[PDB]
Amino acid sequence: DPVLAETMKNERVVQDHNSALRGARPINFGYLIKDAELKLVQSI
Amino acid sequence: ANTIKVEGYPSMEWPTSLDIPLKASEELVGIDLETDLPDDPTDLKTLLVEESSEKEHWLTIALAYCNHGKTNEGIRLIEMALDVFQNSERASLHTFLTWAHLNLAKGHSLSVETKEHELTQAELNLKDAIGFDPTWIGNMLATVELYYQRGHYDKALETSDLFVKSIHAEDHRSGRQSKPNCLFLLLRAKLLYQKKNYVASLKIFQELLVINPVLQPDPRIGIGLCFWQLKDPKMAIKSWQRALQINSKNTSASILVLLGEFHNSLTDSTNDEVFKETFSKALSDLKNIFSENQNNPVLLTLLQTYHYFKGDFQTVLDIYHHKILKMSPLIAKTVLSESSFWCGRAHYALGDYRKSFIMFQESLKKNEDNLMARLGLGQTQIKSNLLEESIITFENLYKTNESLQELNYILGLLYAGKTLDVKTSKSIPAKELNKLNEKALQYLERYIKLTVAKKNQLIISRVYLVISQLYESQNQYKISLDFLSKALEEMEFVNKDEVPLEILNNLACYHFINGDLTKADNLFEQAKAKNKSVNITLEYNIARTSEKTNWEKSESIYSQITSSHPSYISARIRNLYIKFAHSKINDSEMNIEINGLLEMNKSDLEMRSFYGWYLKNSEERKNSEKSTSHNKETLVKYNSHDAYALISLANLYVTIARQEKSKHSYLKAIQLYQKVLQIDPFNVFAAQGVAIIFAESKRLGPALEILRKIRDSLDNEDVQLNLAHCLLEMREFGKAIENYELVLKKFDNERTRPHILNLLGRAWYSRGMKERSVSFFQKALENAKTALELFVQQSAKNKFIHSVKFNIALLQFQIAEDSLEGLEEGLALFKELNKEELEQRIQLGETTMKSALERSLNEQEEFEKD
Amino acid sequence: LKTRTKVYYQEIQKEENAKAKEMAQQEKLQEDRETKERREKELLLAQFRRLGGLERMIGELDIKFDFKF
Amino acid sequence: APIKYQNSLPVPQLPPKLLAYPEAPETNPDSSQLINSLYVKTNISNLIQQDEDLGMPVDLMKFPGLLNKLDSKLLYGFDNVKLDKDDRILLRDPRIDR
Incomplete structure (x- = not known):
């Protein structure tokens, strides 16, 4: 399907499926790794 | 009228009649200099030799000859007096011959050899005149003028200053006052103009007006x-x-006025009506002034510009190669540079970039400050795949032309196009990439600043498109959308219908990303109105934009995309989903089709995601065997850190973790949560799984905080239900209940209304059990009733029917504390539920409760009586 | 150096400079205003003054030459 | 009801596709229209100087009495000329509209 190949070559992606996850707004969550690792290694 | 004539001003007009005395006193032979001049100077030479005529009559008649356009005839006539007048009488004759030969070497209707011959004859007669009378000002002025005409400008200035010094000294020695010599002032002002000292030359040229407003050369x-x-x-x-x-007979003044007319037509015009006639008058004056100055390089270059703007590129080349190139050594370097610039423009428009490069290079050789020629050279470098060379050219031009709007635009587009290239992202580190993006934004925003400051000029609408692309690459959707909108406005604020298809489509995609799909469908259809590829693309976009309203309008477009182009993966995924979630399918023909689509495009990831969602989310494949196998397969022997499938694996592994290997599985899930949080902190679902693990194992303090934050981005029913779960576990009811009504009004999920009503029974359990409450218990019971009804109606026969029924039984029992009627229904349902001690308690409690409630009711009726 | 030529030139220079500077000052504030600015927005929508318009307009011109080159 | 936390991943949301822009050769950096926009501003200036003589040829054949009667009186101008207003405005300094 060559016309479809032209379609594909003329198409950009606004959000791949990982980008789709985050939602309507962005929350930092950069502290979550630190706090989670600490609290769950205290239980370790 | 070759002489300045103004009312009130002096006049430097020559005596129009000369009469000669006859030898021995019949002193009236009239010679009228306009009319009676023989075309053969020998006829008057005989008269002049006969009557022993003076030397000045010879000179006077020769000057009248030369001032009528016959310089050769007058030159001959004085050359005939050279062998008559002899020995120091011929000094003034040599001065006249010097100046006449100087006049003959003035014009581009000449040759290099002819100009050299006339200049050499001039300086030869000058040597002859200096031999006799070296201090007469005619010879001194001829000296300085010869130096000027031979290009020796600072030498001429040196000699002119020395001559002025000597004259001032001689006059100061003899007590007489030195008046300014207008010719020395003129020469000095021209030399200073050559020196680029424009202010001093201006002052001299202005003072000459006061000294003599009739001076020919007009100051x-x-x-x-x-x-x-x-x-x-x-x-x-x-x-x-x-x-x-x-x-009105000054041709230099007319050509300057013509150039000024072109300039004013281009700048002062306020609309095309005024411009098309001002420029037309300029062109007509150009034609007329050209008809008698056809060797004029300025007029020829003007013709070149006109024919370039007219599309006649061959005539530009012809003017260059057939007129200018032949008289090239005789014309000034700047005019040559501009004509070569226009030849190069013609080459550039014809696609010949080698010749255009050569011509712009020649133009720069003749005038290095030819700004537009350097711009053409940079554009030729762009065309010749010399990108970095063009950027070097433009950035070197930027040091002096920092506020040049077109130059900022060019450099910004260049740097942006370099930034949006994949090769450069592969070749240089990321920080350099972002510095490049920043430099492109720098140039483009300065261009926008410069263009808005001059509120008369229109913005090139593309700069906003490029800024939006630059911000889009960095996932800053907000600024990109704002600049795309700003481009749409200005784009539509000129030519209201020709906006490119892609502007409305991409704006609609952005409006789909954030907010509802009302304007997105509008823009998608406006793009559909105005290429076979665009049809498929925006048809998928419209079908994707309707999945919330007229779901079945989406189904049809999806089918006909698949009914004619059965290789668009997104169309098939979304189609199977939409009609699946709209219930035009059974679980078997899903699998088949989905499996057909699964291992069709087997290897890569998007389809697989949908595959995972099929198994996990709704029908048959909840069994984890396939899930383990395939959601691992997404990561087996690939390096993919991708978030969807590995997060599914992690969280559905912690679902199994729900007992030393239980510790094992919990720490595995925590590990994977951290790992996926590393690559993307904004991954809301990883933080939500961490809130789950925090909330599950009795650390429901920070978990509620994390969930409260998560709701600021995610707004699904799932995470908000999770929120309301942790609040019931942690504390009292309103935080728990307040969120369950908000769950129900989040989505029309008929399965989660079941999911809601049992834990709603729990929520009203906890606070009617805090203390006896007879008004709240009944609405608790109502919610539990709706629970059991929703569980009996559907094809769901889980533990839910049993448990829902009991919770209602306990609600009935506690409400009996139309009271007796609910009590009887409670007896009935608890008998239907008939462990052992509980049902024997039920027997004794029926015996107690039915009678005791009848007692309470009769006491209530008796006290209502009174 | 106190000649009538120098002094005359300098005082005419002074007078014309003063006149022109004062005229330039009073131009934008008072001389031409009251919605004539928005007629200069017509100048904004000019074809010859925007991209590609110079050729187009010049193409529309009826006058042309009889070439000899 | 039991408590059971579910990190329900979203549906593989592939939103509408974007379209790349077509050719705009008039607005590319290699466009001659930029040079024409510049021409509208600085158009004919490299032409005001017509020759090295600056359009002001020195003749000496325009001063009566000079080249014939050896009378160099007209090279020193005239006295008490009262310039017209057009010649007097020319005597002012440049760039005085600032």
Whole structure:
């Protein structure tokens, strides 16, 4: 399907499926790794 | 009228009649210099030799000859007096011959050999005259003028200053006052203009007006030149207009007025109506002035510009190669540079970039400050795949032309196109990539600043598109959308219908990303109105934009995309989903089709995601065997850190973790949560799984905080239900209940209304059990009733029917504390539920409760009586 | 150096400079205003003054030459 | 009801596709229209100087009495000329509209 190949070559992606996850707004969550690792290694 | 004539001003007009005395006193032979001049100077030479005529009569008649356009005839006539007058009487004759040969070497209707011959004859007669009378000002002025005409400008200035010094000294020695010599002042002002000292030359050219407003060479030409070079075109054009008004036969003044007409037509015009006639008058004047000055390089270059703007590129090349190139050594370097610039423009428009490069290079060789020629050279470098070379050219131009709007636009587009290239992202580190993006934004935003400051000029609408692309690459959707909108406005604020298809489509995609799909469908259809590829693309976009309203309008477009182009993966995924979630399918023909689509595009990831969602989310494949196998397969022997499938694996592994290997599985899930949080902190679902693990194992303090934060981005029913779960576990009811009604009004999920009503029974359990409450218990019971109804109606026969029924039984029992009627229904349902001790308690409690409630009711009726 | 030529030139220079500077000052504030600015928005929508318009307009011109080159 | 936390991943949301822009050769950096936009501003200035003589040829054949009667009186101008207003405005300094 060559016309479809032209379609594909003329198409950009606004959000791949990982980008789709985050939602309507962005929350930092950069502290979550630190706090989670600490609290769950205290239980370790 | 080759002489300045103004009412009230002096006049430097020659005696129009000369009468010669006859030898021995019949002293009236009239010779009228306009009319009675023989075309053969020998006829008057005989008269002059006969009557022993004076030397000045010879000179006077020869000057009258030369001032009528017959310089060769007068030259001959004085050359005939050279062998008559002899020995120091011929000094003034040599001065006249010097100046006449100087006049003959003035014009581009000449040759290099002819000009050299006339200049050499001039300086030869000058040597002869200096031999006799070296201090007569005619010879000194001829010296300085010869130096000027041979290009030796600072040497001429040196000798002119020395001559002025000597004259001042001689006059100061003899007590007489030195008046300014207008010719020395003129020469000095021209030499200073050559020195690029425009202010001093302007002052001299202005003082010459006061000393003599009739001076031919009109100083006004020079004051206009200096006004122009000092960035005052108005007064320059005014002075040239004055010079033409004073002598309508001055051709330099007319050509300057013509250039000024072109300039004013291009700048002062406020609309195309005024411009098309001002420029037309300029072109007609150009034609007329050209018809008798066909060797004029300025007029020829003007013709070149016109024919370029007319599309006649061959005539530009012809003017260059057939007129200018032949008289090339005789014309000034700047005019040559501009004509070569126009030849190069013609080459550039014809696609010949080698010749255009050569021509712009020649133009720069003749005038390095030819700004537009350097721009053409940079554009030729762009065309010749010399990108970095063009950027070097433009950035070197930027040091002096920092506020040039077109140059900022060019450099910004260049840097942006370099930034949006994949090769450069592969070749250089990321920080350099972002510095490049920043530099492109720098140039483009400075261009926008410069163009808005001059509120008369229109913005090139593309710069906003490029800024939006630059911000889009960095996932800053907000600024990109704002710049795309700003481009749409200005784009539609000129030519209201020709906006490119892609602007409305991409704006609609952005409006789909954030907010509802009302304007997105509008823009998608406006793009559909105005290429086979665009049809498929925006048809998928419209079908994807309707999945919330007229779901079945989406189904049809999806089918006909698949009914004619059965290889668009997104169309098939979304189609199977939409009609699946709209219930035009059974679980078997899903699998088949989905499996057909699964291992069709087996290897890569998007389809797989949908595959995972099928198994996990709704029908048959909840069994984890396939899930483990395939959601691992997404990561087996690939390096993919991708978030969806590995997060599914992690969280559905912690679902199994729900007992030393339980510790094992919990720490595995925590590990994977951290790992996926590393690559993307904004991954809301990883933080939500961490809130789950925090909330599950009795650390429901920070978990509620994390969930409260998560709801600021995610707004699904799932995470909010999770929120309301942790609040019931942690504390009292309103935080728990307040969120369950908000769950129900989040989505029309008929399965989660079941999911809601049992834990709603729990929520009203906890606080009617805090203390006896007879008004709240009944609405608790109502919610539990709706629970059991929703569980009996559906094809769901889980533990839910049993448990829902009991919770209602306990609600009935506690409400009996139309009271007896609910009590009887409670007895009935608890008998239907008939562990052992509980049902024997039920027997004794029926015996107690039915009678005791009848007692309470009769007591209540008796006290209602009174 | 106190000649009538120098002094005359300098005082005419002074007078014309003063006149022109004062005229430039009073131009934008008072001389031409009251919605004539928005007629200069017509100048904004000019074809010859925007991209590609110079050729187009010049193409529309009826006058042309009889070439000899 | 039991408590059971579910990190329900979203549906593989592939939103509408974007379209790349077509050719705009008039607005590319290699466009001659930029040079024409510049021409509208600085158009004919490299032409005001017509020759090295600056349009002001020195003749000496325009001063009566000079080249014939050896009377160099007209090279020193005239006395008490009262310039017209057009010639007097020309005497002012440049760029005075600032």
